[PDB]
Design a protein around this ligand. Structure first.
Ligand SMILES: CCCCCCCCCCCCCCCCCC(=O)OC[C@H](COP(=O)([O-])OCC[N+](C)(C)C)OC(=O)CCCCCCCCCCCCCCCCC
Ligand SMILES: CCCCCCCCCCCCCCCCCC(=O)OC[C@H](COP(=O)([O-])OCC[N+](C)(C)C)OC(=O)CCCCCCCCCCCCCCCCC
Ligand SMILES: O=P(O)(O)O[C@H]1[C@H](OP(=O)(O)O)[C@H](OP(=O)(O)O)[C@H](OP(=O)(O)O)[C@@H](OP(=O)(O)O)[C@H]1OP(=O)(O)O
Ligand SMILES: O=P(O)(O)O[C@H]1[C@H](OP(=O)(O)O)[C@H](OP(=O)(O)O)[C@H](OP(=O)(O)O)[C@@H](OP(=O)(O)O)[C@H]1OP(=O)(O)O
Ligand SMILES: O=P(O)(O)O[C@H]1[C@H](OP(=O)(O)O)[C@H](OP(=O)(O)O)[C@H](OP(=O)(O)O)[C@@H](OP(=O)(O)O)[C@H]1OP(=O)(O)O
Lengths: 102, 601, 650, 119, 102
């Protein structure tokens, strides 16, 4: 048994999980303390956090299964991080636009 | 011991592997043809075997001729390049040490190729002779004359490669002189006496013998090497060498041959260390024996040591000043620390190495004894002398008392390999060092062993091999933690730490520190902003944060301190995780309990 | 002049048959004596033809006598051996008759050996003289060598088969009864030495056959003052007296005949170690070995002249005192003094002085710690005349121990030599020593047996560098040397052999000697990566320091922007100040130590790659800040609990 | 015996090199899970001590997840430490753990959203 | 082909995204809960966070292309941490003095 690849995959999933849990905690903090605009931004940020959470979990399971089958997992991650960064940017700019408007 | 086919397979470096004689193939063909014809031999079988031999001979001759021409071309080109480089020294742009060392590396490669080619040709000639002898012995037909004529007509062995070695050595010497302004691995092994001869014979099939005699005779005293070691009464230098410290010095007065030698080498070994690794710097200078005593007393000034060296002028001033500084430092240390002779390390060394080829070097030290020189017990062993004149090189020193002498029961095999990056040590070396004939004991020191065995009563820290001298190291041809230090003498093994650990020890610290900040981020938040009932949970969070911070500080200060001083570091944390888990859970319970009690009570 | 020696050593019954060496000398010198005032074609074709005729007559007479008596004594030995069978006749053998026959046979064999020795010396001398004075006329060595080949016994300095047969028959007679013993004239860890001449073309093959079994010895220079030439040239200056007594005694096989020499390597300008060595081979009748004794003294060039010429015992005292001061034991000093006295007395009594120099290169093959087999090949042998016998014009000063001509700083001193002062030996000389300590037979040394009978070598029994040097340099002069080695008429011919004929003509001799040895045995029985990894680690450590800095900054600004809403704004502002300074320090210290460690990694020097000051100070400052915050939140500014006050009552 | 081990085919016990990477991997995994736990517990206590009624009720939904992941982290760290102390290995035990913890965290987030929007 | 290096690249991207999340969380919290003077500190912090995330994304994509084509070669990653440290320090100082002034 050579779990080096498995351990690296688990480390990557744990990094993704750090990021997603931090985003989710900050979004939940925005929810229970913000106003209507704050709650909308909290919804957007929690959407991003939970979508990335599900993405990371599904990708982790798939990569582990593929490592067991072949030894390497899917590497289409030129899109995942790109969409994550995009949605984070849109969420922040939407929050700023709502704050400026009101 | 081993068949010839195995010897051929073991002496190759994958470049001469295919072109060796097919000794096993010819032997199998001969045996099978004899068996199939009911032990009989006929003319057709003779012609078939002669065709096989001729094909092998043509292959060997062609490869030898190709390699000979290539080596001649390389020698000529490098000679011209070295002459041009020497000429360029008078120009406005000297070739410099980089060019000179490139020339030296190329010359070393040429020496290696020449030696390998000569060995290859000699082994093939041996195989041809063996095959012919086996033929004319097994069958009733004589093939020696005809095949001797064939071998003469294709003489891959009548090639004087000694002249090439001499010429390349001369070029190397010229380059080193005119230029003067790989991975090296050295291992030490214990050889049982019963396994000595066999071991020696193996090394004799791959390397020649260095003889320190003008007539190339094996005289008794020629191989003797003696070395007096110096120490304080407190054995400061012994502990410095045992605990591998920075600047750890070992001072010795050595000599070669019998006690008629008048040239004593004053040697100093200094242990230097960086995060890159540990290294040993050896510096020695020769001094006439007559003055050695005075030189140890300060009566013989350093300028007197190197007066005639400067007078002759056949020495660069940089080397003269380096030797003068070395002598000044050695004399100053001897006068300051009040160093005295302690142990004499006598042994007979046989050195195997190819001329001008430093890839593999082997030193077999036998009859290794260690005699007591000091007077720490009140007995004046050296009567105001730098060495004991009661004994010479007359092993086994029957005139000595049993307390004064430790006769090391095994011989010491010192294997030094200098392998350029891209290749590996030769197969014969690899199966020599991993066979049953040797017992690898890395970092064995004759000075440390002598001090530990002879001055045991004055030593409270011994090397790891000392309580293991009763272990039978003989092994049949092809886990132990019970080694406990004796009462009052702890085994000292310095622990070296990989450079990356220097960051890992920091990594976890930060990984803990951040967490504590987060906990602190809660503890402050419930105090400066929290309601009076929130301060109750802040109590638990404050306790948890302080505990985490204190544990982190103490753990990593201890880790840094123990990575220094070369102490063993326990890298398993069995307290921090459980403590932080319990404290965090109890803090959350305390906060929730305070809120719930405020609600219901 | 060897004519006087011939006359004095005349055995009267054979007086007619000796070489008329004086007569041949007179025909050679007639070209100078006759027509003393007309040096015009003094040596005509008629003179040459007459000289060849005379040489033919002398060869025919002398060697016909030698072969005739050889065969006669062989017939006598056959008549003595016819009783070595038919055991009934063996028991009837008269011991007195056999003893008398063996006595007469051994005396006759010794007389024939002397006959052959002086006559061979004379013929070789006259042949060399004719060749030297008449180079424009054809060499007469051919007739001498052909007549030597027409001999049923090969003269190569080994004992003739006569003495072997005599020893066998003496042993047989003693085995029979040995009751009245025999006459005193009966002649019988052992070791054996073989000596071969190897042609250059064969050298590289022969060494291979040696290197299969024995490793090559590489000369390693002893470390010296300079330790803070790949292979040297061994030079040996052999001593001898005016009458060449040592050479004669060593050539005549007199047991205990010593050889004295001064041996060194390199050039004397280097000041190398010089060893005065006296080497002796002893062979006694009751013994069965050739016990060798060597006495060597390390001399100094300053003291050699007085030691060997003035009989000055000052170097002995000097060396003894020096070695005693070095701590050498008393027994070693006693042995050294005995050696000094022995060599000094030997030189003084024998009136020895340096005679000839021999320089060569030595290659040795031997297993360390194993004396069983040793092989030694001497190449590039050159002999230089260093004698002071020429009283009018000595080659070297008689008060100096070596020639100053060839020991100067001029880089080709060998030009100083003139004709007759030097000689080069054309073949390499091989010596194989086998130390047969056990009394059994040869313990699986068949490769030596192969080499000895091979086509690659030419065995020369009882060869010696000193004897060859004396013969080549002083042999042609009748004033000094009057006896010559038997191997001299072998250098001129090609010693090489045909590899195919190794088993066509060299096996002729091989199998003849083999049949001889087996028949003898039969009758006797019947009787880098690290740098990159650490660089990456430094990168990541700086990243984590930046992460801690960012976390502290977040805490700082979160409390700073809400200080007004805090329950205790003064404490919140103080906390914000402390955390702002913490963040600034964390950033600056992170960058500083990143730079310092980067310098350490690229400049690969430094004991450790740690920096605990910053971590320790950050952590203690955080602890102090948290404690101060707690105290202010529960003391004077927020006084609610001095000791243990707060309970579950809100 | 200060780290003196004997190689399988030799007779003299030599000093042995311990590899701290194995322990560092366990420490890093536990510290990542501890970051999870600390952040979730901070969220829970912040909601409990500063939120309204809905926030106070929903604080438990994250506190429980924090306790679950803390227990899981401690148990897995100690089991991995026990494994490495003897033979090592044991990777096929962290599939349903992380998945279950992510499921419970998502359920808590959705429940918080529901009580926030509904009320 | 080599899961380990791909996982390391993703872990580095998420390590930078950690900075982005912390700084952007502080900025968004100040934006939705701060006064007028705090709301420009919010803009400065979110600008720093946006730059950090954009640099992380660009570096991740470039390193992904490099590892896909050739392999390895992390020796060129020196400027990013230096600029991030400088920007963190200057932003912290500017925001602190701006809040202190008003
Ligand atoms: C482990 C997670 C926590 C740490 C993550 C961040 C690391 C750095 C630590 C930053 C600490 C921030 C200090 C307080 C910031 C300002 C708070 C404030 O103004 O409170 C006033 C108000 C005052 O509340 P109040 O109105 O009930 O006060 C009553 C007092 N009188 C009557 C006088 C008004 O508190 C809040 O509304 C919210 C405070 C807590 C914030 C909720 C936490 C949600 C978690 C995500 C946000 C993370 C940042 C805050 C972390 C707090 C952790 C409990
Ligand atoms: C690219 C990334 C995008 C951004 C990532 C997601 C950002 C989500 C934003 C999180 C905001 C959290 C707000 C906490 C509650 C606010 C406190 C409050 O009540 O306001 C008090 C005070 C004022 O209270 P107030 O409500 O009385 O103010 C009245 C003014 N109006 C009416 C406009 C509201 O506000 C502050 O000044 C608080 C300072 C901002 C706090 C920011 C904290 C950020 C911490 C991030 C650290 C993350 C570390 C790990 C954490 C893990 C999760 C726990
Ligand atoms: O196994 P080999 O490499 O072919 O050589 C061995 C042995 O030599 P080693 O023991 O060193 O291997 C002898 O080889 P030579 O000395 O002749 O060169 C030879 O024995 P002989 O001397 O009697 O010829 C012969 O052994 P044998 O011919 O008795 O069988 C042979 O062993 P194999 O023939 O079994 O291979
Ligand atoms: O090769 P060096 O760089 O010169 O290092 C030498 C070498 O041993 P190592 O290579 O294994 O370190 C010596 O062996 P020799 O040079 O005599 O062949 C050894 O001798 P000891 O076995 O007695 O220790 C001792 O050098 P020295 O003989 O001058 O004391 C040693 O240095 P270390 O102490 O670092 O091993
Ligand atoms: O007389 P030299 O041929 O010139 O040799 C002497 C001799 O050297 P050795 O001791 O090795 O034989 C001196 O020692 P003594 O035997 O004469 O006592 C020695 O003197 P120091 O070692 O004490 O300096 C030294 O020097 P010096 O010329 O002063 O005598 C040396 O001289 P070389 O350098 O010429 O060999």
């Amino acid at each position: 048994v050579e779990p080096k690849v498995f351990f690296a995959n688990e480390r990557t999933f744990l990094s993704w999980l750090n990021f997603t849990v931090m985003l989710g905690g900050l979004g939940v903090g925005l929810l229970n303390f913000g106003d209507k605009i704050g709650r909308v931004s909290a919804g957007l940020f929690t959407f991003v956090a939970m979508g990335t959470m599900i993405y990371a979990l599904v990708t982790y399971h798939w990569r582990a299964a593929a490592i067991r089958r072949r030894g390497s997992g899917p590497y289409d991650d030129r899109l995942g991080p790109t969409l994550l960064c995009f949605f984070l940017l849109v969420a922040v700019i939407i929050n700023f636009i709502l704050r400026l408007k009101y | 011991m081993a068949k010839f086919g195995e010897h051929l397979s073991k002496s190759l470096i994958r470049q001469y592997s295919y072109y060796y004689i097919s000794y096993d193939d010819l032997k199998t063909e001969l045996e099978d043809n004899l068996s199939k014809n009911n032990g009989q031999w006929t003319q057709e079988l003779e012609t078939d075997f002669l065709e096989s031999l001729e094909i092998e001979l043509d292959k060997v001759y062609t490869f030898c001729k190709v390699k000979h021409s290539e080596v001649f071309r390389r020698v000529k080109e490098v000679q011209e390049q070295v002459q041009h480089t020497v000429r360029l020294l008078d120009s406005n742009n000297p070739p410099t040490q980089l060019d000179f060392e490139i020339l030296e590396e190329e010359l070393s490669d040429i020496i290696a190729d020449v030696h390998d080619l000569a060995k290859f040709s000699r082994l093939n000639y041996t195989g041809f002779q063996k095959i012919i002898k086996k033929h004319d012995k097994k069958t009733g037909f004589i093939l020696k004359p005809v095949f001797q004529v064939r071998l003469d007509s294709k003489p891959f062995f009548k090639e004087n490669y000694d002249e090439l070695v001499v010429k390349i050595s001369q070029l190397y010497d010229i380059a080193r002189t005119s230029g003067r302004p790989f991975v090296r691995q050295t291992t030490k092994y214990w050889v049982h006496p019963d396994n000595i001869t066999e071991l020696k014979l193996i090394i004799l099939k791959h390397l020649p013998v260095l003889v320190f005699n003008t007539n190339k005779e094996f005289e008794r005293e020629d191989s003797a090497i003696t070395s007096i070691y110096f120490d304080n009464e407190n054995l400061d230098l012994y502990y410095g060498r045992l605990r591998k410290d920075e600047g750890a010095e070992a001072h010795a007065l050595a000599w070669y041959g019998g006690m008629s030698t008048d040239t004593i080498f004053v040697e100093r070994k200094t242990h230097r260390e960086d995060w890159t690794g540990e290294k040993s710097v050896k510096a020695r200078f020769a001094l006439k024996e007559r003055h050695v005593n005075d030189f140890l007393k300060g009566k013989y000034t350093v300028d007197q040591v190197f007066a005639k060296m400067r007078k002759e002028g056949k020495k660069p001033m940089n080397e003269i000043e380096n030797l003068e500084a070395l002598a000044s430092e050695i004399q100053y240390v001897m006068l300051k620390k009040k160093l005295r002779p302690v142990v004499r390390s006598f042994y007979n060394r046989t050195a195997f190495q190819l001329p001008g080829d430093a890839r593999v070097r082997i030193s077999l030290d036998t009859e290794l004894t260690m005699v007591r020189e000091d007077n720490f017990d009140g007995v004046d062993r050296t009567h105001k002398n730098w060495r004991r004149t009661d004994i010479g090189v007359d092993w086994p020193f029957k005139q000595l008392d049993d307390k004064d002498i430790c006769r090391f029961p095994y011989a010491v095999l010192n294997v030094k390999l200098q392998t350029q990056l891209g290749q590996e040590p030769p197969e014969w070396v690899r199966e020599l060092v991993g066979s049953h004939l040797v017992e690898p004991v890395p970092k064995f020191s004759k000075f440390i062993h002598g001090v530990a065995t002879l001055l045991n009563d004055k030593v409270d820290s011994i090397p790891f091999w000392l309580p293991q001298m009763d272990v039978d190291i003989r092994k049949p041809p092809l886990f132990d933690t019970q080694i406990r230090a004796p009462p009052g003498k702890t085994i000292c093994v310095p622990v070296r730490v990989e450079p990356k650990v220097y960051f890992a020890t920091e990594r976890t610290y930060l990984s803990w520190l951040s967490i504590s900040i987060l906990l602190g981020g809660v503890s402050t938040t419930l105090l400066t902003y929290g309601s009076p009932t929130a301060m109750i949970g802040s109590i638990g969070f404050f306790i948890t944060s302080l505990a985490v911070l204190i544990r982190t500080v103490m753990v990593y200060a201890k880790r840094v301190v123990n990575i220094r001083l070369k102490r063993a570091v326990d890298y398993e944390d069995k307290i921090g995780p459980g403590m932080v888990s319990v404290f965090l859970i109890l803090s959350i319970l305390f906060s929730f309990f305070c809120n719930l009690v405020a609600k219901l009570e | 002049l060897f004519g006087i020696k011939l006359a004095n050593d005349v055995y009267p019954p054979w007086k007619d048959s000796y070489i008329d060496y004086e007569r041949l000398k007179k025909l050679l010198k007639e070209s100078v004596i006759h027509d003393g005032r007309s040096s015009v074609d003094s040596w005509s074709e008629r003179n040459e033809s007459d000289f060849v005729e005379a040489l033919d007559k002398e060869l025919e007479k002398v060697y016909t006598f030698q072969i005739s008596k050889y065969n006669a004594v062989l017939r006598k030995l056959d008549d003595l051996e016819e009783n070595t069978k038919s055991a009934e006749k063996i028991q009837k053998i008269n011991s007195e008759q056999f003893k008398n026959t063996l006595e007469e046979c051994l005396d006759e064999a010794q007389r024939l050996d002397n006959f052959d020795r002086l006559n061979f010396t004379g013929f070789i001398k006259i042949v060399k003289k004719h060749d030297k004075l008449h180079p424009n006329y054809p060499s007469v060595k051919s007739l001498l060598q052909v007549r030597l080949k027409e001999l049923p016994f090969n003269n190569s300095e080994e004992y003739s088969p006569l003495l072997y047969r005599i020893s066998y028959l003496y042993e047989f007679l003693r085995s029979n009864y040995d009751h009245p013993n025999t006459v005193s004239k009966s002649l019988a860890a052992s070791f054996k030495s073989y000596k071969f001449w190897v042609h250059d073309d064969n050298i590289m093959e022969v060494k291979a056959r040696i290197l299969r079994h024995l490793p090559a010895l590489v000369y390693a220079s002893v470390p010296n003052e300079n330790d803070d030439s790949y292979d040297p040239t061994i030079t040996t200056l052999y001593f001898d007296n005016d009458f060449f007594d040592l050479y004669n005694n060593r050539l005549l096989k007199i047991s205990g005949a010593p050889t004295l020499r001064l041996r060194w390597i390199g050039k004397l300008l280097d000041k190398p170690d010089i060893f005065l060595e006296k080497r002796t081979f002893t062979e006694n009748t009751e013994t069965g070995n050739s016990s060798f004794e060597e006495i060597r003294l390390q001399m100094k060039a300053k003291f050699i002249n007085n030691f060997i010429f003035k009989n000055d015992p000052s170097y002995k005292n000097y060396l003894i005192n020096q070695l005693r001061e070095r701590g050498t034991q008393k027994e070693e000093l006693e042995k050294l003094s005995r050696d000094f006295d022995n060599i000094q007395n030997f030189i003084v009594e024998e009136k020895l002085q340096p005679v000839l120099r021999a320089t060569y290169n030595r290659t040795a093959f031997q297993i360390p710690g194993d004396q069983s087999i040793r092989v030694t090949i001497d190449s590039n042998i050159m002999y230089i005349r260093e004698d002071s016998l020429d009283k009018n014009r000595p080659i070297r000063n008689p008060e100096n121990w070596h020639r100053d001509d060839i020991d100067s700083n001029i880089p080709n001193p060998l030009r100083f030599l003139r004709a007759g002062e030097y000689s080069k030996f054309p073949y390499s000389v091989m010596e194989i020593k086998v130390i047969n300590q056990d009394n059994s037979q040869m313990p699986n040394y068949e490769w030596i047996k192969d080499l000895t009978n091979s086509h690659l070598v030419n065995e020369v029994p009882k060869f010696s560098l000193y004897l060859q040097g004396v013969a080549s340099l002083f042999g042609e002069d009748d004033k000094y040397v009057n006896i010559l080695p038997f191997w001299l008429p072998d250098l001129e011919t090609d010693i090489r052999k045909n590899p195919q004929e190794a088993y066509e003509e060299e096996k002729k001799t091989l199998q003849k000697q083999k049949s001889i040895h087996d028949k003898l045995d039969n009758m006797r029985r019947l009787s880098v990566k690290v740098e990159a990894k650490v660089w990456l680690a430094n990168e990541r450590t700086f990243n984590r320091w930046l992460s801690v800095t960012t976390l502290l900054s977040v805490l700082t600004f979160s409390i700073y922007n809400s200080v007004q809403k805090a329950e205790f704004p003064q404490l919140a502002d103080l906390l914000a100040y402390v955390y702002f300074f913490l963040t600034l320090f964390c950033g600056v210290w992170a960058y500083r130590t990143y730079l310092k460690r980067l310098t350490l990694i690229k400049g690969r020097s430094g004991k450790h790659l740690d920096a605990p000051v910053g971590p320790i100070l950050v952590a203690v400052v955080l602890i102090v800040t948290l404690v101060v915050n707690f105290s202010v939140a529960f003391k004077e500014a927020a006084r609610r609990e001095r000791g243990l006050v707060n309970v579950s009552s809100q």
